User: What shape does this take?
Amino acid sequence: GSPEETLVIALYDYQTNDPQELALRCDEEYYLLDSSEIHWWRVQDKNGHEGYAPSSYLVEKSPN
Assistant: This one.
């Protein structure tokens, strides 16, 4: 239960200022890709949209 990839939940509706960031929705979650880093958490939407996301305005969801 640690494929180096989990899901997160956006506490607040964070918007993207460029293809670099990923638009987040309140209550919604995304696919965590690069969690090892620390500067910025990389997330991916089920639509194939990825971008840097603030790990601060969100929390880990873990599998199951």
About this structure: DSSP finds no helices and five strands in the chain. The beta strands are 7-10, 29-32, 41-44, 50-53, 58-60.
